Design brief:
8% of the residues lie in helices and 29% in strands. It is mainly beta. It is globular. Its cofactor is Zn(2+); Co(2+).
C-alpha cells in the first residue's frame, strides 16, 4: 500500500496512480516573484459559525477531523470560487523536524506543518461526485510555524493519545475550526490536485500567506502518532508530506499586491 517510506513513498506512487505525473499535480513551490496579482479576485468568505465536528480518525497516513456536511453548516465561498463549498474534513501534514513538514513551499521555504481544510462543491450533490469534476473541490491551505502556542489547537492535541494507531477513531464534537485561522485572509490560488492517492485533479487551491504559530510541544504530540495499526511494529507518523511538483502550464494568482 502507498505510504511515505522508502519502498512505498511519493516517488513510487506513479506505479499505482499514473495521474501522479499529471499536468495539474500538487503541491508546488509558490514563487512570489512570479505569482500575479489579480484585481478581479474577490475576498474569501469563510462561514464556519455553524460548523458541526463529529469525529477524529487516524487513517494510517494522517488524522482527519470530520464534519457533518449534509447541509450548508460550514461553507467557503468568494475568492476564485464559483458557488458554495462545504467543509468535509481537515487534516495536517508535518515533518520529523521543525525545518520541514509543509507540502507547499514559498520561495523554496518549508514550514513545520501544513493544515488542509477540504471542501466540496455543493452543486455536485456529494463528495463522491465532486471528485469527478475539474472544479469539484476547494482546499484551504494554512502554514504552521513553530513559535507561540495556538490555543484553539490544543483541543485536537489532547485527543491524539486516543487515536494513536491506524483505524482508531474518537468522538470529537463541538470543535470550532475558526480557532485555526490566521488574522489575514490574503492568499495565492492555483488549480491543482489532492496530495495523496488517488491524487485527483479536482482542486482549486487557496493557500493563505499568513501562517499560524504553534508551540514546539504541540507539534511534538503530532509526531507521537503511529502509521501502523495496533499490535504491529511501531512506525512514528512523521514526514507525511509530498515533495513539490512541476508547475507546468499553470499560473499562480495572488489576492494581494
Ligand atoms: N484515502 C481515501 C480517504 C481519505 C480522505 N482523506 C484522506 N484520505 C480517499 O480516497
Ligand atoms: Hg492511509
Ligand atoms: Hg477532477
Ligand atoms: Zn492534505
Amino acid at each position: 500500500h502507498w505510504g511515505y517510506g522508502k519502498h512505498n513513498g511519493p516517488e513510487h506512487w506513479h506505479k499505482d496512480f499514473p495521474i501522479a505525473k499529471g499536468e495539474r499535480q500538487s503541491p508546488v513551490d509558490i514563487d512570489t516573484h512570479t505569482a500575479k496579482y489579480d484585481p478581479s479576485l474577490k475576498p474569501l468568505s469563510v462561514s464556519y459559525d455553524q460548523a458541526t465536528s463529529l469525529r477524529i480518525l487516524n487513517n494510517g497516513h494522517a488524522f482527519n477531523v470530520e464534519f457533518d456536511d449534509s447541509q450548508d453548516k460550514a461553507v467557503l465561498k468568494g475568492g476564485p470560487l464559483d458557488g458554495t463549498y462545504r467543509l468535509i474534513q481537515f487534516h495536517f501534514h508535518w515533518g520529523s523536524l521543525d525545518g520541514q513538514g509543509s507540502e507547499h513551499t514559498v520561495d523554496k521555504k518549508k514550514y513545520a506543518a501544513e493544515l488542509h481544510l477540504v471542501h466540496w462543491n455543493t452543486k455536485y450533490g456529494d463528495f463522491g461526485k465532486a471528485v469527478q469534476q475539474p472544479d469539484g473541490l476547494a482546499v484551504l491551505g494554512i502554514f504552521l510555524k513553530v513559535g507561540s502556542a495556538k490555543p484553539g489547537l490544543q483541543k485536537v492535541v489532547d485527543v491524539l493519545d486516543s487515536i494513536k494507531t491506524k483505524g482508531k477513531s474518537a468522538d470529537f464534537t463541538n470543535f470550532d475550526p475558526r480557532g485555526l485561522l490566521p488574522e489575514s485572509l490574503d492568499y495565492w490560488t492555483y488549480p491543482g490536485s489532492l496530495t495523496t492517492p488517488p491524487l485527483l485533479e479536482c482542486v482549486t487551491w487557496i493557500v493563505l500567506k499568513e501562517p499560524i504559530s504553534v508551540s514546539s510541544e504541540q507539534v511534538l504530540k503530532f509526531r507521537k502518532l503511529n502509521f501502523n495499526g495496533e499490535g504491529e511494529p511501531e512506525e512514528l507518523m512523521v514526514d507525511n508530506w509530498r515533495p513539490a511538483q512541476p508547475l507546468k502550464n499553470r499560473q499562480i494568482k495572488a489576492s494581494f499586491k
